[PDB]
Amino acid sequence: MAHFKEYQVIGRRLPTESVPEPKLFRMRIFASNEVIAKSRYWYFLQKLHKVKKASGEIVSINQINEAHPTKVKNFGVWVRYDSRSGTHNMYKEIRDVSRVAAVETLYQDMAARHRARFRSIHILKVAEIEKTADVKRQYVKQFLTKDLKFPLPHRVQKSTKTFSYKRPSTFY
Amino acid sequence: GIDHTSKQHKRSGHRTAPKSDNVYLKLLVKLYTFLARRTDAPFNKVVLKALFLSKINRPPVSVSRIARALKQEGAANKTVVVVGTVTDDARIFEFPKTTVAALRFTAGARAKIVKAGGECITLDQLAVRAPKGQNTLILRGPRNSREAVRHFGMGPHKGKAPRILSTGRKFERARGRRRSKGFKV
Amino acid sequence: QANNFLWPFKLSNPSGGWGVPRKFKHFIQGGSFGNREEFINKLVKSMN
Amino acid sequence: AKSKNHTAHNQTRKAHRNGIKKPKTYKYPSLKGVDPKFRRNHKHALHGTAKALAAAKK
Amino acid sequence: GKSHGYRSRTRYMFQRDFRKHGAVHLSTYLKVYKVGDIVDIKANGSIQKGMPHKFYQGKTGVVYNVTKSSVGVIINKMVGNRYLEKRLNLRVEHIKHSKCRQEFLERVKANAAKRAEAKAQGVAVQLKRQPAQPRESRIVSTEGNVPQTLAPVPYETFI
RNA sequence: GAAAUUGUUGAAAGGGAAGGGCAUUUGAUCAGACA
RNA sequence: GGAAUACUGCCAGCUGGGACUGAGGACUGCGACGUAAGUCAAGGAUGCUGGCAUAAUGGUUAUAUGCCGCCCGUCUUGAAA
RNA sequence: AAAUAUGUAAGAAGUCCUUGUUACUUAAUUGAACGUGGACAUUUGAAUGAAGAGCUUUUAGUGGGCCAUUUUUGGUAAGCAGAACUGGCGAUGCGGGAUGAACCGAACGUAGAGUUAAGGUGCCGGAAUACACGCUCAUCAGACACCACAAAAGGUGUUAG
RNA sequence: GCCCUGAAAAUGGAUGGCGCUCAAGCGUGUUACCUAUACUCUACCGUCAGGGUUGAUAUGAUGCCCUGACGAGUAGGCAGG
RNA sequence: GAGAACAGAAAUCUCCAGUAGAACAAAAGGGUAAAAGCCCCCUUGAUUUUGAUUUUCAGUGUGAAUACAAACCAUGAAAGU
RNA sequence: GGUUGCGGCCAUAUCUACCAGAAAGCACCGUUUCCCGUCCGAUCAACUGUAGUUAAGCUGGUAAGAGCCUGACCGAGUAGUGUAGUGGGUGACCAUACGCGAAACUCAGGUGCUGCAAUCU
Ligand SMILES: [Mg+2]
Ligand SMILES: [Mg+2]
Ligand SMILES: [Mg+2]
Ligand SMILES: [Mg+2]
Ligand SMILES: [Mg+2]
Ligand SMILES: [Mg+2]
Ligand SMILES: [Mg+2]
Ligand SMILES: [Mg+2]
Ligand SMILES: [Mg+2]
Ligand SMILES: [Mg+2]
Ligand SMILES: [Mg+2]
Ligand SMILES: [Mg+2]
Ligand SMILES: [Mg+2]
Ligand SMILES: [Mg+2]
Ligand SMILES: [Mg+2]
Ligand SMILES: [Mg+2]
Ligand SMILES: [Mg+2]
Ligand SMILES: [Mg+2]
Ligand SMILES: [Mg+2]
Ligand SMILES: [Mg+2]
Ligand SMILES: [Mg+2]
Ligand SMILES: [Mg+2]
Ligand SMILES: [Mg+2]
Ligand SMILES: [Mg+2]
Ligand SMILES: [Mg+2]
Ligand SMILES: [Mg+2]
Ligand SMILES: [Mg+2]
Ligand SMILES: [Mg+2]
Ligand SMILES: [Mg+2]
Ligand SMILES: [Mg+2]
Ligand SMILES: [Mg+2]
Ligand SMILES: [Mg+2]
Ligand SMILES: [Mg+2]
Ligand SMILES: [Mg+2]
Ligand SMILES: [Mg+2]
Ligand SMILES: [Mg+2]
Ligand SMILES: [Mg+2]
Ligand SMILES: [Mg+2]
Ligand SMILES: [Mg+2]
Ligand SMILES: [Mg+2]
Ligand SMILES: [Mg+2]
Ligand SMILES: [Mg+2]
Ligand SMILES: [Mg+2]
Ligand SMILES: [Mg+2]
Ligand SMILES: [Mg+2]
Ligand SMILES: [Mg+2]
Ligand SMILES: [Mg+2]
Ligand SMILES: [Mg+2]
Ligand SMILES: [Mg+2]
Ligand SMILES: [Mg+2]
Ligand SMILES: [Mg+2]
Ligand SMILES: [Mg+2]
Ligand SMILES: [Mg+2]
Ligand SMILES: [Mg+2]
Ligand SMILES: [Mg+2]
Ligand SMILES: [Mg+2]
Numbered sequence A: 001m002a003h004f005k006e007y008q009v010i011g012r013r014l015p016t017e018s019v020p021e022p023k024l025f026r027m028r029i030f031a032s033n034e035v036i037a038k039s040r041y042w043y044f045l046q047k048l049h050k051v052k053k054a055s056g057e058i059v060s061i062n063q064i065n066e067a068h069p070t071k072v073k074n075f076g077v078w079v080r081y082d083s084r085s086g087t088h089n090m091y092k093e094i095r096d097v098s099r100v101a102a103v104e105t106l107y108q109d110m111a112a113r114h115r116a117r118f119r120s121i122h123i124l125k126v127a128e129i130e131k132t133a134d135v136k137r138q139y140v141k142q143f144l145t146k147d148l149k150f151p152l153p154h155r156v157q158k159s160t161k162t163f164s165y166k167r168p169s170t171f172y
Numbered sequence B: 001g002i003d004h005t006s007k008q009h010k011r012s013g014h015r016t017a018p019k020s021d022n023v024y025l026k027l028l029v030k031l032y033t034f035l036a037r038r039t040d041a042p043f044n045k046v047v048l049k050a051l052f053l054s055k056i057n058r059p060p061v062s063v064s065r066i067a068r069a070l071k072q073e074g075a076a077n078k079t080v081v082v083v084g085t086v087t088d089d090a091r092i093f094e095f096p097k098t099t100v101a102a103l104r105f106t107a108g109a110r111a112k113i114v115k116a117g118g119e120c121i122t123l124d125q126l127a128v129r130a131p132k133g134q135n136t137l138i139l140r141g142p143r144n145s146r147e148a149v150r151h152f153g154m155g156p157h158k159g160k161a162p163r164i165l166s167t168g169r170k171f172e173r174a175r176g177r178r179r180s181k182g183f184k185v
Numbered sequence C: 001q002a003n004n005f006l007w008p009f010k011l012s013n014p015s016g017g018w019g020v021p022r023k024f025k026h027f028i029q030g031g032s033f034g035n036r037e038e039f040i041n042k043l044v045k046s047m048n
Numbered sequence D: 001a002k003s004k005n006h007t008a009h010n011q012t013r014k015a016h017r018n019g020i021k022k023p024k025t026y027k028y029p030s031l032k033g034v035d036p037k038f039r040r041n042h043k044h045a046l047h048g049t050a051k052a053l054a055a056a057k058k
Numbered sequence E: 001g002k003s004h005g006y007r008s009r010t011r012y013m014f015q016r017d018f019r020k021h022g023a024v025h026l027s028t029y030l031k032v033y034k035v036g037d038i039v040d041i042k043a044n045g046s047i048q049k050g051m052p053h054k055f056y057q058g059k060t061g062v063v064y065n066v067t068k069s070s071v072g073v074i075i076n077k078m079v080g081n082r083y084l085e086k087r088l089n090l091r092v093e094h095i096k097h098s099k100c101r102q103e104f105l106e107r108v109k110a111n112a113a114k115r116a117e118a119k120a121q122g123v124a125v126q127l128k129r130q131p132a133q134p135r136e137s138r139i140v141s142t143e144g145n146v147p148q149t150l151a152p153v154p155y156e157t158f159i
Numbered sequence F: 001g002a003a004a005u006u007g008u009u010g011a012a013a014g015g016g017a018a019g020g021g022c023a024u025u026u027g028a029u030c031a032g033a034c035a
Numbered sequence G: 001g002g003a004a005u006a007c008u009g010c011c012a013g014c015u016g017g018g019a020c021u022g023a024g025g026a027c028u029g030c031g032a033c034g035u036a037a038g039u040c041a042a043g044g045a046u047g048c049u050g051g052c053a054u055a056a057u058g059g060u061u062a063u064a065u066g067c068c069g070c071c072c073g074u075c076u077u078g079a080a081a
Numbered sequence H: 001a002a003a004u005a006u007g008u009a010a011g012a013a014g015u016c017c018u019u020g021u022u023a024c025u026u027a028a029u030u031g032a033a034c035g036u037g038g039a040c041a042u043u044u045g046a047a048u049g050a051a052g053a054g055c056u057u058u059u060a061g062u063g064g065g066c067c068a069u070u071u072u073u074g075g076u077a078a079g080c081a082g083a084a085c086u087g088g089c090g091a092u093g094c095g096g097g098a099u100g101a102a103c104c105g106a107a108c109g110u111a112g113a114g115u116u117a118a119g120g121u122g123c124c125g126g127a128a129u130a131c132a133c134g135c136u137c138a139u140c141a142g143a144c145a146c147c148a149c150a151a152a153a154g155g156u157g158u159u160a161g
Numbered sequence I: 001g002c003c004c005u006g007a008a009a010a011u012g013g014a015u016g017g018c019g020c021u022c023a024a025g026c027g028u029g030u031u032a033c034c035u036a037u038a039c040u041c042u043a044c045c046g047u048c049a050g051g052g053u054u055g056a057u058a059u060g061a062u063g064c065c066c067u068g069a070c071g072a073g074u075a076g077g078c079a080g081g
Numbered sequence J: 001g002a003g004a005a006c007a008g009a010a011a012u013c014u015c016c017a018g019u020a021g022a023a024c025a026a027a028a029g030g031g032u033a034a035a036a037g038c039c040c041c042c043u044u045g046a047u048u049u050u051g052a053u054u055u056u057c058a059g060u061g062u063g064a065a066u067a068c069a070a071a072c073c074a075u076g077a078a079a080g081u
Numbered sequence K: 001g002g003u004u005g006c007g008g009c010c011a012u013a014u015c016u017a018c019c020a021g022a023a024a025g026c027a028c029c030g031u032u033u034c035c036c037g038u039c040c041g042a043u044c045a046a047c048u049g050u051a052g053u054u055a056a057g058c059u060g061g062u063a064a065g066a067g068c069c070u071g072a073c074c075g076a077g078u079a080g081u082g083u084a085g086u087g088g089g090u091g092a093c094c095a096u097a098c099g100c101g102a103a104a105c106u107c108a109g110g111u112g113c114u115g116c117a118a119u120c121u
């Protein structure tokens, strides 16, 4: 659905005479602007509590920045998604440098592999896989092996004008 | 485009000069549009429009209807103004003094007034005498006395008068006008 | 009275554009309509 | 040769060109269809109180 | 073919209310109506004489006549592009005084009050009703109330 | 002594119709204003 | 610990390039700049310079070229049919 | 027992006080109706709007309708037949959907400049053979709403669970 | 999920055509860019409305002057020509 | 339901339970329990005069209906109807 | 507080089963000359208030009672629904966006209130 930010959102049911200071609940929400975020928040709250936006209030919205944005990380990701004939829980692992990048490719991957659009997905958990060997999906362990190296065969350099006088070469 | 909310290019619906083609009338109108643009007296404003009025919206005022207005408490010395003809009424036996300013005065109406030593004044004469209409009583005549308005709104249970030509028993007095011949109206 | 006095403003189309390929869904779904909160300014400024 | 039977299509479009005109309202409505016994009395009642207020200009 | 008699279509609407059949309670009759009173109309199926036609069910008119056992009620019904006036002869069993105006009356007698309580003190009147206003700022606390973090939940089947 | 329609002369265009609209090249033709 | 930067927003901060337009026809208004006299971009273009002075610009016409263009009249829910 | 629809009310034609009229009505100068006299002005009693509001006369054409979303009856079904609310076509061009009455965008005085809609940008054809991550190789691949169809059932093709 | 089997009709033919395969295909994201009789600003026409102005000694008072908004149209109405 | 010679599935007698599961000409739906049903008593308001009103509606007619007014009666101890 | 007569709301007043009720009242209760009604002085009528009784009526209280009434982020923001899209899907259908929002369920808490008049340890 876009380029994401992650938000702490905090809300509560509106106060009353007999119940002033109601409980206060938080969600980390992955959206692109705060307007989508707040909306998403109410979407899940009503999937959980007796509340609607009409009878409750947003208390705080804050963007959370990645703690070590230039550290590579092995993400484990949990998702609930809807297919054309059923709904489904799922676990992928993503390797990137922020939760926020991670969630971007997840959404991509789901749309690509399972034709799932944004409306049809529920991120359940996104958490850092602290020690390798708890990394489980092979397309990731692949990139943890020691002293790793690889070529990129068949170089295609992009021509900047319609004709060329050489004949290219894919060396690299 | 525009979601209009009222009909476009609508004429205001009020006359703006008279339909009439009389020089003199067109001069009187020349006079009062001046006085109405330049004196802010309401009277001049009323008169300017009454001049545009057509023959129906100008029923005649009778000298007796005139006599009655002066009979108003506080009003005997006012000058009655009539933007129309004034007519005679042999039914009153005692007509007061005063000063009537009208468009036309019938022969007898003019006599009756004068015979009691009153004055008949044209509007322009009235204007010079009273450019703000000071001390003036405007009178209009009975519009819905016209024979025509008898037949407006004809329908069941309205009581209104058939558009009818010959008119006696056996002209439209049977089935539909009495309980014993079908039904009543 | 202050506000009725002001004739409805007559803006042009946004200059940057609308930012979206289809206008007639809600802002929250990647469209243009509805309460878009304080992002209203970026838009209007491109239309004024 | 059959044809359409009935529809209200377009009907409220027409009703709204020129109105649904509100009912219109009067200070002093008609006593029409009011109890005759009442009205009869109400008459002389009024006649009396008029006569009085006239005597008030003695 | 078709049928459109007087009480056609009125099966559940002139019906009697669960567990409320029988005699009408007597208070219905100790009520007193004067001309000008606003009444609501609602047919009592058990009282066949002097019954509002179904069109006037749920409707609110004004008394214009008072009779041994009835009130005459004027309702404006709208036919065509317009309203016409209808007078209804209704027995007291199909009418009740409308609370549609109690608010107003409440509000006026109150409004005349705080107008004196103001005026004869040194004004600060302010007695028009205003719509629900948006919320002012506020500071919500945490002492005894740290936010609990919720996530969405996995699919499951219970069955 | 119109038009349909025809002959000749001049000019022009034409790869399964012609005619039309906006626009400009090209050719022909011409008004006006300048002093 | 103490900074930088991104991102979003603001400035009645400054400044370059390019396009269309120039309605109006004494003065009259609201202002700006100056010690002042004056001045000004403040209720709609002026200044300076060149070329032609005639088919040159422009009109008309024929043709060519880009895109576009079904046969009108009628009755009909609906016609190029 | 909803939702959507739906009646009435939100004042000067209002609220309150003092006490006249009658043949109605009361046990009753009791009531009921209509009043005379007095007290309180625009925060006078929610919002938004109002190129004003009200009213009268007279007359044309029309009285084959069709379509879309949603509700919906008959029928296996129909580009079938019949209702509900709205919006359209008919009566209407303009941009998009190659094409098309009804879909999408948008409604038309003559024009300049700008920006957009819906829909597009390999070439036809104005506009990135643009960026990015996956997926797919079809000895009848696939390619954008309305829309110009495909189903049960199968695959040790390949992908992710 | 994509692909493949399941998948048979009559003139030769249609993702609009060419053609495209790490697409010019399918899902999804991000920018930029093209262009409606629509939107913004301006000129001009006309319609409707609101102002101003009889003061001669010169020419239209149905005039003249300021201003604001609006413009689809069959049947059909009316108006100026 | 439980009880009584002939008497049985069904005759007539008694007690208990009983929200209506019956009955109210008729189609069906509303309605009704010291009644709107069943038994009895008394009766002719199924009458006289001429308007208003509701449904259908053009707010025409007709049908059917409602609430009054002016009579004369019925019934009831009566309010009443 | 009891009770009676007349009531208003018309189950928190009803239903089933037990037990308790002082004082007054109400009640049951005795009688058949009279008005009056019956197959039957049971009902209905009258007479006594004297001869008798709390047994029933009535009132109240008990019950992991039946019913009924009330409450609640119990269920459930569920079902259903107004509005939107050139959203998904061959379809049947289904997600999403801005709103409105049940019923059953489950748990807890109750089990007549009150007006006028007379009367009472
Ligand atoms: Mg972090
Ligand atoms: Mg006459
Ligand atoms: Mg810009
Ligand atoms: Mg641009
Ligand atoms: Mg830019
Ligand atoms: Mg698009
Ligand atoms: Mg701009
Ligand atoms: Mg036929
Ligand atoms: Mg047909
Ligand atoms: Mg027809
Ligand atoms: Mg039927
Ligand atoms: Mg009857
Ligand atoms: Mg000759
Ligand atoms: Mg040309
Ligand atoms: Mg100029
Ligand atoms: Mg000029
Ligand atoms: Mg020349
Ligand atoms: Mg030259
Ligand atoms: Mg030629
Ligand atoms: Mg040509
Ligand atoms: Mg073409
Ligand atoms: Mg024809
Ligand atoms: Mg045909
Ligand atoms: Mg409403
Ligand atoms: Mg306003
Ligand atoms: Mg106005
Ligand atoms: Mg007509
Ligand atoms: Mg006609
Ligand atoms: Mg006709
Ligand atoms: Mg449509
Ligand atoms: Mg037609
Ligand atoms: Mg159109
Ligand atoms: Mg086109
Ligand atoms: Mg197509
Ligand atoms: Mg091509
Ligand atoms: Mg191109
Ligand atoms: Mg680019
Ligand atoms: Mg689809
Ligand atoms: Mg399959
Ligand atoms: Mg597979
Ligand atoms: Mg294909
Ligand atoms: Mg293509
Ligand atoms: Mg793509
Ligand atoms: Mg244009
Ligand atoms: Mg403009
Ligand atoms: Mg036009
Ligand atoms: Mg029945
Ligand atoms: Mg009884
Ligand atoms: Mg009879
Ligand atoms: Mg009638
Ligand atoms: Mg008739
Ligand atoms: Mg009738
Ligand atoms: Mg009938
Ligand atoms: Mg005792
Ligand atoms: Mg005896
Ligand atoms: Mg006994």
Ligand SMILES: [Mg+2]
Binding pocket: K045
């Ligand atoms: Mg007895």
Ligand SMILES: [Mg+2]
Binding pocket: none
């Ligand atoms: Mg006992």
Ligand SMILES: [Mg+2]
Binding pocket: K058
């Ligand atoms: Mg008792």
Ligand SMILES: [Mg+2]
Binding pocket: none
């Ligand atoms: Mg219980």
Ligand SMILES: [Mg+2]
Binding pocket: none
């Ligand atoms: Mg659902």
Ligand SMILES: [Mg+2]
Binding pocket: K081
């Ligand atoms: Mg819905």
Ligand SMILES: [Mg+2]
Binding pocket: none
């Ligand atoms: Mg739409």
Ligand SMILES: [Mg+2]
Binding pocket: none
């Ligand atoms: Mg859809």
